Ligand binder design. Structure first.
Ligand SMILES: */C(=C/C(=O)SCCNC(C)=O)CCCCCCC
Ligand SMILES: */C(=C/C(=O)SCCNC(C)=O)CCCCCCC
Lengths: 171, 171
């Protein structure tokens, strides 16, 4: 794949249909599971471990679907969805490096939610710091993640793990 | 609250509206974020640590919203939603014990996904084992959770943490 440092919302939507990295590359979820609007920076070096970095953003507005049901009369973006965005970015990066296969989240170490995303916020920022990448027969990524809302850190996740699989018959 | 050992779909829908545990108890998310169809068992003793146990189920059918977008052409229930159902059950239990306040997931320690939920599955079972409950004027619940698909253990989550809050304007 020809690597770009950033991707637009249109690119992320093309990705969900497998039109970005080709038919062998991984796909990002499509709405309403897509949890980012754009990827503002992607590098092979950099990040807290100098092994890779990804920064993405999600624009917030009061009308996003999840505010209406989580919860009724007490809108707050589900934490699980910010967490999924992080898994999505780790998997996307693996595909960006040329990894082939279907994306499947494998797990995460500690996750801490210290703040919330309200319908009055404006922008959610995701930062992924890669600590390890296996791109041999097996394609797997390990990273730490940070979620900020309007420049303030609210969630951290250690050891997000995602792999790409050509055969998912054993799951 | 007048504890019942089990709750039906209609009870969970009333919960999302704030009718089940009253105006001061926690609310479950409403569809499309409600991740269970019923709670089959709730006991304050029992469970792996004999400090509480809850078992719930989610009926699976190909038409569930998430199957159409995650991923297009490769349907699999998002692992993040299975995690949310477990946080949802921990908070529901704190309200069941009589706790007052709005539920907020605080984090989780370690999550491992070893299997997937396909649209061909029939049922997902959630089993929550409580470790510690602080129901003082600081309501928090700590528990380990397991997710099974048609009886097969596929996800384990250690140290799920949820708390109920009177005032959430601090986050
Ligand atoms: C959507 C679904 C899952 O990953 S379900 C995880 C099941 N795990 C196993 C081992 O079967 C989340 C997709 C995140 C990764 C997207 C990569 C582009
Ligand atoms: C929906 C939203 C969240 O919990 S967002 C977490 C934000 N964290 C803080 C500290 O503000 C999930 C609700 C799960 C618990 C429901 C209990 C009934």
């Amino acid at each position: 794949v020809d690597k770009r440092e950033s991707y637009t919302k249109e690119d992320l939507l093309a990705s969900g249909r497998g039109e970005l990295f080709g038919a062998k590359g991984p796909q990002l979820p499509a709405p309403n599971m897509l949890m980012m609007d754009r990827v503002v920076k992607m590098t092979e070096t950099g990040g807290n471990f100098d092994k890779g970095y990804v920064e993405a953003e999600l624009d917030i507005n009061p009308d996003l679907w999840f505010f209406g049901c989580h919860f009724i009369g007490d809108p707050v973006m589900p934490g699980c969805l910010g967490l999924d965005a992080m898994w999505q970015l780790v998997g996307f990066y693996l595909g960006w490096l040329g990894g082939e296969g279907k994306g499947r989240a494998l797990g995460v170490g500690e996750v801490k939610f210290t703040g919330q995303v309200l319908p009055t916020a404006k922008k959610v920022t995701y930062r992924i710091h890669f600590k390890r990448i296996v791109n041999r027969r097996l394609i797997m990524g390990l990273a730490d993640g940070e979620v900020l809302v309007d420049g303030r850190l609210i969630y951290t996740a250690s050891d997000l793990k995602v792999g790409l699989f050509q055969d998912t018959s054993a799951f």
